[PDB]
Amino acid sequence: KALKVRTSATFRLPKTLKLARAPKYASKAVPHYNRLDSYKVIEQPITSETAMKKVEDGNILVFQVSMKANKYQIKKAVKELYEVDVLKVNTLVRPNGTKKAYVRLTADYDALDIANRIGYI
Amino acid sequence: YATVSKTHKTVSRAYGGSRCANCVKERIIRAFLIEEQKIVKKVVKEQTEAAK
Amino acid sequence: GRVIRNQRKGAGSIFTSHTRLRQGAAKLRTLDYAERHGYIRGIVKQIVHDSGRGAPLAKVVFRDPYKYRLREEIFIANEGVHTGQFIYAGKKASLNVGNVLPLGSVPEGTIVSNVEEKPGDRGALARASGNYVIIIGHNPDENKTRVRLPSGAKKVISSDARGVIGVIAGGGRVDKPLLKAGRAFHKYRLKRNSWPKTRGVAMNPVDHPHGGGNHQHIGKASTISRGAVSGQKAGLIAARRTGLLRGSQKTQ
Amino acid sequence: NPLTHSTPKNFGIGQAVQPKRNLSRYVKWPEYVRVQRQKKILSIRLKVPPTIAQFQYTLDRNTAAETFKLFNKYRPETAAEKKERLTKEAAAVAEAKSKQDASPKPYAVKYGLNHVVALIENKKAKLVLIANDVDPIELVVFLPALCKKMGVPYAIVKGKARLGTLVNQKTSAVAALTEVRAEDEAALAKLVSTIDANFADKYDEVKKHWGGGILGNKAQAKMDKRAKNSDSA
RNA sequence: GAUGGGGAAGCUCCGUUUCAAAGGCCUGAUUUUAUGCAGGCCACCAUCGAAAGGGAAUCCGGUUAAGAUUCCGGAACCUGG
RNA sequence: GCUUGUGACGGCCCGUGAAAAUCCACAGGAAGGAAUAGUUUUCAUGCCAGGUCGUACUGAUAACCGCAGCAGGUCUCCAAG
RNA sequence: UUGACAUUGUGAAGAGACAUAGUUUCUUUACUUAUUCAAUGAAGCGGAGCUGGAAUUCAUUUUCCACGUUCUAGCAUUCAAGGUCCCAUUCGGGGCUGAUCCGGGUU
């Protein structure tokens, strides 16, 4: 028969079928459970004289937070665990390797009340 | 220039925010004349062909 | 002994070219079909200053003969070429200052810069300010051609080898005295780390053959043999003659 | 004719972007292609010795077709057939009880290089099919000698894989025949004779013809019209 | 400074787009369903290398024992969806 | 006036004084789109969203380097009469 | 650096013996396939023919050449319009031509 026609002088890699993985046996045997549930996210409250005076005039909820977790994971955790909507979350890494969340509860809720619920006064 | 309405990046003639009118003028005159003289020297060499 | 300066230059470190500001490598179009059988046109859309090269370059722009796009070329602007000018390149092309002709297509006495050695290498000879080559005759069968280079040497190269009509701009650049150290300083600022230069006779025998002595002096013949080895070659290497050139030179 | 125009186009150096063409003659193949090609080139540019190149003289479509016909009439047992035969003597012989000769004398093409060679030496094979594309050529180049020495008709057949087909293998260096059913018997000498016209009888005259040395066209054209001009003034 | 490679007994050395079969985007093809491929361009080829170079976008006021163009109050602006 | 910013110019060079990401525009016309209804999200208004890390203080005749709370050394901005 | 040997093959002219037949050995020069240099998104090579027509015809062609672009600092891209062949006619789509054949040695 006949050859082929090539409108270009550049032999490029013949596009080939990419077959995917069919593991004839497992990766791990059991998927690792959630490594950062909300119980791990927020670790302890922070009850400084200045941190309470944050909760007085601020409607703020200070927490010691897992340094593996970011703004989103702290919002979702505060919400789910303390039953609140959250306006914004400000964070910082205090000089001893711990995350200090400066959560601010939306206007609706009162952080003051929310303290003596969880139990620190 | 991406935070701003198109009328800030153009003037309403062809070749707006590109060339400067006075340039587009030459672009035109040079275009017409040369496409014209590109006929004069056709008919001319026609004559040289049909007669030599 | 120490290793002498002219040894440490070739490891190339502090010595390498001062390349940051250079416009690009100036060379002719690739030798293709357009230039092989006929001619092709271009606009010198700019002649500009290359740093560390006292002869201006000409940016010449072309159409690409295979895709719809512009190609830009960097030339060494010959003397007289101007912005806007058209440039023709290839076998059948006019004999005007600027165009590029296979050395065959020119008669005895044409003058051409950036001329190739082997054809196709995009240029190699008489590329400096003022420099040009002259054609002193062709050998039609065995299509060679013969030229007198800047250094008056009588070489023969292919007739299909290309050159560009005229001499190179910025001539007699070397007539104005540098006057002062700084002007030399700034000259080599954009060339290479070879200034200022210290005299070997002013250094120590560790540092040089000429190095050492209670009197400052070369201490032995400064004409060094070709077969000398690194560390040795300083002074007048392989000199077939030496001393003040009495008489009219030129080439025989 | 209506609102349409004929504008041709001028693809002639210095105008009009070139039209797509068939640059097949120019493409930059992968080196695995360059090396399998330039080998073929290098194979013939050199004067090749006449103990090789007595190959490259390969059988023709006609004669080979009937020689492939006659050989396909002698395939070896397929996997199934032998199982079929197996349980035809597993069932029998153990009950019917015949001295392993509850089975007919088999008739097939002999193969495997090492097998065939010993057969040629034992003067027992009658027709030898030597492949011509055995890449370590040294495997099979001594079989034209062996046959002519042992007085067996041989034939350098085109197709080492095709040779394999008629014997249930991907490939085979050689095909052979020691036996031929009484039917095909007389039919054999026809194909043997035809063969010995192009091979077994030529040999000695081909053993002294150094093959190859053949030029490629760009420098064959060079010579071709060089010995035309400077002679016919 | 990896990679194809070429050096080197070897630690490794050379080289950086270089004698390499080097990749991925529009979205259509679907109305078996979620992604094969139908066009088509592209050969653009690692990567690291500036807290003074380049550079999307925030200001005023108030406030702390110690923080702020980062909190609060007000008033904007940018980018992505 | 001082400092500082910007302009239009001018002197100088065998010195003629980086890149790249990125954003825009244009030439182009592949396409796609209405009369009972299409088009537009470079016009206005409207919704959501913006992770990670650094953020204290010293910067020196005591928080740095000089065995030290050493007459040394250590880049810089603001600058009243 | 300079010599020999290996990488190292292939022709032709001329010398070198058994001493004026060719196996073999070299001084001059050819060959390309090893080896070496160069450039390019390996792009238009080499061979043949269309036309053209200088050529001078010494049978009729014995040939050599050329075979898209040069006043202008414009524009040149959608496998290309034109031609024409098909689907069983859509809206869209392809073949051939346009763009001469032949050899796959990128040059």
Side-chain angles (χ1 to χ4, degrees), chain D residues 1 4-13 15 18-19 21 23-28 34 37 42 45-46 216-219 222 225:
Chain D
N1 181 268
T4 214
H5 294 51
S6 161
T7 60
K9 256 178 193 189
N10 191 339
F11 300 139
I13 299 200
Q15 52 183 131
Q18 235 57 207
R21 299 207 167 94
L23 311 169
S24 143
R25 225 193 58 85
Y26 302 132
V27 305
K28 190 185 167 186
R34 271 169 27 99
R37 287 185 192 166
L42 210 275
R45 302 296 142 107
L46 282 304
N217 53 322
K218 255 171 171 304
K222 183 195 64 54
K225 273 66 180 295

Side-chain angles (χ1 to χ4, degrees), chain C residues 2-43:
Chain C
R2 224 178 273 280
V3 132
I4 55 183
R5 146 184 62 213
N6 70 258
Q7 263 171 309
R8 303 195 330 252
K9 299 194 115 172
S13 123
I14 66 184
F15 296 107
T16 83
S17 200
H18 290 213
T19 211
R20 182 185 47 112
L21 294 192
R22 323 191 69 83
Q23 294 280 353
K27 12 112 167 288
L28 305 180
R29 279 178 39 91
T30 285
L31 193 261
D32 78 304
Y33 188 100
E35 281 203 26
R36 276 191 295 141
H37 302 286
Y39 64 106
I40 201 175
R41 202 186 61 164
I43 356 166

